[model samples]
Target: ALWQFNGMIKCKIPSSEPLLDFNNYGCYCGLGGSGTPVDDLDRCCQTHDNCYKQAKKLDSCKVLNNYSYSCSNNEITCSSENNACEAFICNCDRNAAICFSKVPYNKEHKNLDKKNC
Candidate 1:
């Protein structure tokens, strides 16, 4: 369980082994944007031990997590999945919400016609 949760959060507790980081998961005030609240809590409360207990006492974590989770029914949204399509996110170059690939014909790419989902 701990191993799995490790992959979910990107920050690590206080460490002096290295340098350079924007890490240190936690909810802070004076922020604006969708999913910002839960994002803060998720980072702050994210610990290998299910990130529970101490972080859950913050109330902010609970409130934000509740708000964020309410939308997805606890399944949670993957950051990568945001705007993802067919395993390839749209790389819109000139149109709104239009994602197109600039690559040439495929040779070893997924030939969907010969396979089934």
Candidate 2:
């Protein structure tokens, strides 16, 4: 699965229940994104931003720490031959868990459009 959605199944609710009832966050945030958006969606940035927020708020995306390597733009393409930014990104994603934190692609990592960063 994409790193952005890793472990988000931990946020899913039963089909018979309100889809957004995750983590019992109560009242607002938990109820915000309780929909049927699945893990493999491509428009997740715009479509499920709320669900994404809720997943993070409830600590559900914490299991995505497998540490694959890549050069990336908005997503990982492939790791550097030496994987210079792997350490930085793994730390950043592990800390942020939002997955879009890999910006300033050239400075901290590498070229975003090329087979780097």
Candidate 3:
């Protein structure tokens, strides 16, 4: 017998207001090594719905790869090939949703865990 596996994790920002200064919100993906592709992803404003749509539209987030990550104004969604993976941590700005590699323990204090899958 054989089987195929596929799934997605969804997160939504409850607030309609812009969470962070449009200049701070963006997507960051792991690049294994080479300083990581944290800044390779795009950035946009949460004020526009298109901004969220654009993040979701990224090919990396669609498929399991080095650049596989997505982010929106108040939300961040990510997909992966492994099922054992844990939740993602988004480094949101004051009012923006920033996707982090791990769940920020002290988000309100600006402190980070720095460990993620």
Candidate 4:
């Protein structure tokens, strides 16, 4: 099975449930918070989380810690080499980052705790 590392799933698993749904979605921030999105910016993170699952659809790109890399642009492309894993995940971050930049931040979003804060 492909491990979810470096923020990318190396390969798609033949499991019944999707990898994205495996973990509950929320605005994961700074190794803290209750996995809750406190604003539109948090929603951006929501998109980012899902993007990783979509990237995993590429079975050709599979790896874990060794595939670490950085993202620099809004446009994302996957390579045939092992870097494909890195690129896919990087693009996901890029997309999320772009969204955060455009979306305003405020204590005006829903939280997983079923409370509006």
Candidate 5:
């Protein structure tokens, strides 16, 4: 779940869901004094943009915490937010392990995906 002072975006992973298949479950958001539920893949894509915009309005909306999660097999990984203003990258790999601002990458956390953000 991702929350912001200006808006809230929540994502749920179903027990039977697969990694990289984010469309299997639903996503919800609260904005403009209303709560919106997304069930279709197309709607999910559109809602993602709205969530990002609202989240970006927060004072704490740093790229460090901006990410998209993907499930792979029994594990989940995350990619940094696009257009992040930070100088470093943050990623979460299998086992829910996190790699933070490691320069030139580290072999110990080699699984971290390289993202432009």
Candidate 6:
């Protein structure tokens, strides 16, 4: 839901406050990635992490929500699942994309892994 839309995305909203560490930043998936951020890409992740916490605090994250819940032979059929948290995440993700336009990962760090903070 977050990725598909550009309204603006990031980490899934957490039930409890999760640790925010540069040592645990990466490129894809929820809570996936490790080591210190090699560059601005990690900064995007950090921003997203904070955004997630804020969304959680606001209690905006939801489940079983569908973007389109209609099925008609005459009309465009559609079915998708989404959540309230998506709005915050989408923004974070959009911010990240903006960041990407300004700052990119260093070639040296592209293949590296498990970097310490």
Best by TM-score: 6
TM-score for each of the candidates: 0.16, 0.20, 0.18, 0.46, 0.26, 0.49
Angstrom error of the Cα, residue 117, model 5: value is 29
Cα lDDT tens digits, model 4, 1-117, are: 123232332122222132343233334422234445666666666667667667767775544323443223323334445366666665675465456446654433323443431
Any idea how many clashes model 6 has?
5
Q: Give candidate 5 misplaced runs (Cα > 4 Å).
A: 1-39, 62-117
Q: Whose lDDT is higher: candidate 1's or candidate 6's?
A: 6
- In candidate 2, position 79 carries an lDDT of 30
lDDT (CA) per prediction: 0.23, 0.30, 0.26, 0.46, 0.29, 0.43
The superposed Cα distance between candidate 3 and the true structure at residue 32, in angstroms, equals 35
The per-prediction CA RMSD against the true structure, in angstroms, equals 20.2, 18.1, 14.8, 11.2, 16.3, 10.9
Model 6 is weakest, by summed lDDT over 10 consecutive residues, at: 7-16
Q: Please, what are the lDDT tens digits per residue for candidate 5 over residues 1-117?
A: 322111111122233122322222232212221233322332443344454555556555553354355545434444454334221112211211211111122232222222300
Better of 4 and 6 by lDDT: 4
Ordered from best to worst lDDT, the candidate numbers read 4, 6, 2, 5, 3, 1
By TM-score, the better pick of 4 and 5 is: 4
Error of 2 at 86 (Å): 1.5
Model 6 residue 71 CA deviation (Å) reads 26
Query: Top lDDT: which candidate number?
Result: 4
Pairs of colliding residues, candidate 1: 25-43, 25-44, 26-44
Candidate 6 local distance difference test against the native? 0.43
Model 4: how far residue 114 lies from native, Å: 4.5
Candidate 5 matches the true fold with a TM-score of: 0.26
Q: Quote the positional error of residue 113 for candidate 4 in Å.
A: 2.9
lDDT of 5 at 48: 47
